[PDB]
């Protein structure tokens, strides 16, 4: 993991939820999604020209969504249709991601966590279905799919498991890769 896993951030990021939890869209596009410390952005009508490779997107149950144009994903939560979010590798080795509004937790701190998933301990109320954008189920878990190692090559050592999620009333049987 060249300069990727060395100093991303602790899995127990400091600060907690001071009170009510809000919805925020900080439009976070600074660096590649090397680790789970990221803030995706909502992208509407996209130019389906530079997109290359699979465009798997996470319902969470991953589904291949081919662009409806050649030389389009209006992100919405499954209760309102569509998918939570997803990522793609395009152009010259540049990886990009998109997802619902990055879920922020009301609190104080120099580096308060812009919770993209789970983060229950920092905020007892943070459920994936309401506070999640990308494929990270928990700060140390992923939804394993064939291109998972092509998108996050720093998650080789993780072990696979079979899990049953319940989003609303719908039941998702899925494999998830987590370490120990």
């Amino acid at each position, epitope marked *: 993991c060249p300069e990727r896993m060395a100093h991303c951030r602790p899995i127990d990021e400091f600060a907690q939820g001071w009170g009510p939890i809000t919805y925020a869209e900080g439009h976070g596009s600074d660096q590649r999604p090397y680790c789970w410390h990221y803030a995706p952005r909502q992208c509407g009508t996209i130019p389906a020209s530079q997109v290359c490779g699979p465009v798997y997107c996470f319902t969470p149950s991953p589904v291949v969504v081919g662009t409806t144009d050649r030389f389009i994903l209006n992100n919405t939560r499954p209760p309102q249709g569509n998918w939570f979010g997803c990522t793609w590798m395009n152009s010259t080795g540049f990886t990009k991601t998109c997802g619902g509004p990055p879920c922020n937790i009301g609190g104080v701190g120099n580096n308060t966590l812009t919770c993209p998933t*789970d983060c*229950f*301990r920092k905020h007892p109320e943070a*459920t994936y279905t309401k506070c999640g954008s990308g494929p990270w*189920l*928990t700060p140390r*878990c992923l939804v394993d799919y064939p291109y998972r190692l092509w998108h996050y090559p720093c998650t080789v050592n993780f072990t696979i*498991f*079979k*899990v*049953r*999620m*319940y*989003v609303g*009333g719908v*039941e998702h049987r899925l494999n998830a890769a*987590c370490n*120990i």
Partner: antibody
Amino acid sequence: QIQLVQSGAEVKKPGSSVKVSCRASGGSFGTYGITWVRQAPGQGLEWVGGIVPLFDRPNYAQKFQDRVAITADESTSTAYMELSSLRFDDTAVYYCAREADIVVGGSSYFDSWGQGTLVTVTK
Amino acid sequence: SVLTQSPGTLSLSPGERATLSCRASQSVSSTYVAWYQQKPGQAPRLLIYDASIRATGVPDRFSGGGSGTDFTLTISRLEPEDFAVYYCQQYGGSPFFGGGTKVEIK
């Protein structure tokens, strides 16, 4: 798969809090869930709650919310259940069982159980 | 009152048949049911999960079944060591146990 369920508080007082422990010997702690189910002297079993100590988010039944907490210490491979605001109806035996499969937001069936710890509430 | 067992208390003698019933109220439940057994004091045991899959260590006498609703646990060739208080629970998204029949083998 030997649950040396440690006795908690055999005798308690109304309005007090009770911590019940459950120790898992062998296996890999942090991959299978621990579930707490209680049964009164003569009644049916009641699902108190459960936890999976890898997705840090315990599950509680509908009628045991805002009054029960569940924690898991992986460094010592133990699972604790803290029940507050005890009532004279709480007199029962609390078991500790293993979830067969990992579930998020749901429950599962219990494979191997453990010795029950009596919990007597009296004045 | 979601899951209930009609027969309530029961009493038979060895070499007989008992057919306990667990009546899921409204939802088909997607075929998620489990059956247990509780001796007079010992810990419960798991007999059937999914109503059609048998665990390890229990004989084939405990044959369970059901489709959509009204899952059943058929006990054939009753033995003296079959007295218990059987239980039925449905897991998944709506976890809840059921009523306890009171087989009275003698």
